[PDB]
């Protein structure tokens, strides 16, 4: 069989991981992804292959190929995907997508940090992105704090945003955030590994993390704490070679605990979009 | 004739630069300080030692003496003078104190930062300093602000401070700062360049900020403003390879510029009193 990009959802479906699949590509490449449903069961390692292949045999092939065009989508045998996200470990091997694609072909700065931010923190993240003067496209996660800070920052500057989210491209999360979520899912672009009414379970934000650092060269943090899932991000980011630029704050409140902890430990401190562009 | 103490003040009275004496200090080594007038105006190394020879002699012996005397002092040529500071350009030459010298055998810290701080900027010095866990003496220089809050901080734990001052002993600057400048003289040490009745003149204040920084192994940094006292003080210790603990804050301000300006240039950022004690150079 020919493995296209709905071969590819099914196989998820089926209950191959991400890492499985990646495997069963790597293998298929010198062979134009044609292989046999019997060798991609061997291929990805998976523990009951017979188990595989019944899942996958009971699959309703009308049913899940609704569901997979819902909303349209790419994965890492497509030349639209980026170069910067394949170099990770885990890359996602299939995005669904809402917006305008040209915008993977930019320059991209990722920005992180408190889910419950302070006023002065949103301000700093403003400053920084104006200062950027639209010359990067600001990827976050639409989640509450200075992710929504930095997306409406780059917005009112007049240049183009990316958010990746933790749920399937029809649900909306943080819920306040719906309007946001369909307008750069309109005129920019909003990316999902998740399919269509997939919920905001725990899990999907780390992974979704991964996709957030990968997709940029550098990453901007603001209000991180010591054990936040702003720093996990940028530590995760530091081990696969991307530059971190932290914002700094004061040391009584304990909002910039991590932000100082990343700057001692090697990170680039921040005052402007100037420090960040001097750079990259 | 053989220069004492009271020689060295008596160069200065004369006209003679602090860089000129160590000229002439450096060269009378190995003859045991005695050279004769004509030799000390040539080894100095200034404009008109006609006019220098001629201050000298002008010069009241009895009137200079009783000046001299008012407050207790000590020079380069001491064995009480810190090693550390004799290692800077420009090694003050001379200087006149109060207090107790003892304070300069232990280890030393300075204190810099903004004369017109924040209560957020004084409270983060204070925080710093009590994370010191009274290990470290103090120095600053009674200047409003940080300067104060650093001075206060060590007291209050009952630590130690040392003040190095822009004006002579009996003048107080800033006027608000008396008793503390007072209570520093009683329990504590202040050292000053200038004799008695000398005015806080604009250029005895970056002067005086050369012996706050050659006293310690590093400086502390909180509310440095873009080309302030405080960043010119750091830069300049970087320079006599002193480490330099910058404490961070808002990048909305411009209070902390300095500091943010210092850290992107290779200086440590700095939490706590901890954080200074893990990269202190001690021996």
Redesign the interface.
């Given at each position: 069989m020919k493995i296209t990009n709905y071969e590819i959802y099914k196989l998820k479906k089926s209950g191959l991981t991400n890492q499985q699949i990646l495997k069963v590509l790597e293998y298929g490449e010198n062979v134009d992804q044609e292989l046999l449903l019997g060798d991609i069961a061997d291929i990805s390692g998976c523990r009951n292959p017979a188990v595989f292949m019944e899942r996958y045999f009971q699959i309703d092939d009308a049913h899940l190929s609704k569901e997979f065009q819902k909303f349209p989508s790419f994965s890492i045998l497509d030349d639209c995907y980026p170069w910067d996200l394949s170099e990770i470990y885990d890359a996602p091997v299939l995005l669904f997508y809402k917006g305008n694609l040209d915008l993977l072909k930019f320059p991209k700065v990722a920005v992180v940090g408190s889910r419950a931010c302070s006023k002065?923190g949103a301000?700093?993240v403003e400053?920084?992105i104006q200062g950027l003067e639209n010359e990067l496209v600001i990827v976050s996660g639409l989640a509450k704090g200075i992710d929504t800070a930095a997306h409406m920052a780059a917005l009112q500057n007049g240049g183009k945003t990316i958010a990746v989210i933790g749920t399937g491209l029809d649900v909306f999360y943080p819920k306040a955030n719906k309007r946001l979520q369909d307008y750069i899912g309109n005129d920019h672009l909003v990316l999902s590994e998740y399919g269509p009414g997939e919920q905001p379970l725990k899990f999907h934000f780390p992974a979704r993390n991964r996709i957030i650092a990968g997709l940029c060269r550098g990453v901007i943090v603001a209000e991180a704490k010591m054990r936040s899932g702003s720093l996990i991000t940028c530590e995760r980011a530091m081990e696969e070679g991307r530059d971190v630029f932290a914002?700094?704050?004061?040391?009584?409140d304990g909002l910039?605990?991590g932000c100082?902890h990343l700057?001692?430990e090697g990170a680039?401190?921040?005052?402007?979009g100037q420090?960040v562009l001097a750079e990259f």
């Amino acid at each position: 069989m020919k493995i296209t990009n709905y071969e590819i959802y099914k196989l998820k479906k089926s209950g191959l991981t991400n890492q499985q699949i990646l495997k069963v590509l790597e293998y298929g490449e010198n062979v134009d992804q044609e292989l046999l449903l019997g060798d991609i069961a061997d291929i990805s390692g998976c523990r009951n292959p017979a188990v595989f292949m019944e899942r996958y045999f009971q699959i309703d092939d009308a049913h899940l190929s609704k569901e997979f065009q819902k909303f349209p989508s790419f994965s890492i045998l497509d030349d639209c995907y980026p170069w910067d996200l394949s170099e990770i470990y885990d890359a996602p091997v299939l995005l669904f997508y809402k917006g305008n694609l040209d915008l993977l072909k930019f320059p991209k700065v990722a920005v992180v940090g408190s889910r419950a931010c302070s006023k002065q923190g949103a301000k700093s993240v403003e400053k920084v992105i104006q200062g950027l003067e639209n010359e990067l496209v600001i990827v976050s996660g639409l989640a509450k704090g200075i992710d929504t800070a930095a997306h409406m920052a780059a917005l009112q500057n007049g240049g183009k945003t990316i958010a990746v989210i933790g749920t399937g491209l029809d649900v909306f999360y943080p819920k306040a955030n719906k309007r946001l979520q369909d307008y750069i899912g309109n005129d920019h672009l909003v990316l999902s590994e998740y399919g269509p009414g997939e919920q905001p379970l725990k899990f999907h934000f780390p992974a979704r993390n991964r996709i957030i650092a990968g997709l940029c060269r550098g990453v901007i943090v603001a209000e991180a704490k010591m054990r936040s899932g702003s720093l996990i991000t940028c530590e995760r980011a530091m081990e696969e070679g991307r530059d971190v630029f932290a914002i700094p704050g004061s040391i009584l409140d304990g909002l910039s605990d991590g932000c100082h902890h990343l700057i001692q430990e090697g990170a680039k401190l921040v005052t402007s979009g100037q420090d960040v562009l001097a750079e990259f």
